[PDB]
Design a protein around this ligand. Structure first.
Ligand SMILES: C[As](C)(=O)[O-]
Ligand SMILES: C[As](C)(=O)[O-]
Lengths: 80, 79
């Protein structure tokens, strides 16, 4: 019944911090990965072309394309 | 002074998603000069009818990343 896809994405440090702090509870992404509610994002801290070896895991709990540019979606996320 | 209180209309599908904490953001034109700390009073409507319910949320985050001109995504925290 449930088969989430795990997506591993880079996230620039400023936004990583905002997510980890639960101030930013969504991700704005091109929908080239067929994102679905229940999917898992592994958000990997990245800065100036380097992975910084910190991450956080979040579930996609809501998706919308409302008012977005072609191909973009807003993914509502719940940090684990 | 105090944080601004904005009163906005929200359709029942989205109202329900906000109340359930599934939808934790609001996509809006920024013609209100929204600021972090501001309060949104979200009033429930459906197909032009006011549905005698509402909720309150704080704007905790704001971004125009990848948005159309004048648009923002407001991160909101249900009270
Ligand atoms: C600016 As983003 C891709 O972390 O929503
Ligand atoms: C769809 As809305 C204006 O409640 O982000």
């Amino acid at each position: 019944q449930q088969h989430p896809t795990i997506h591993t994405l880079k996230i620039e440090t400023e936004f990583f911090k905002a997510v980890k702090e639960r101030r930013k509870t969504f991700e704005i992404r091109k929908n080239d990965r067929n994102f679905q509610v229940g999917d898992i994002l592994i958000l990997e801290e990245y800065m100036n072309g380097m992975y910084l070896d910190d991450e956080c895991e979040a579930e996609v709990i809501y998706i919308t394309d409302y008012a977005q540019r072609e191909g973009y979606v807003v993914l509502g996320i719940e940090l684990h």
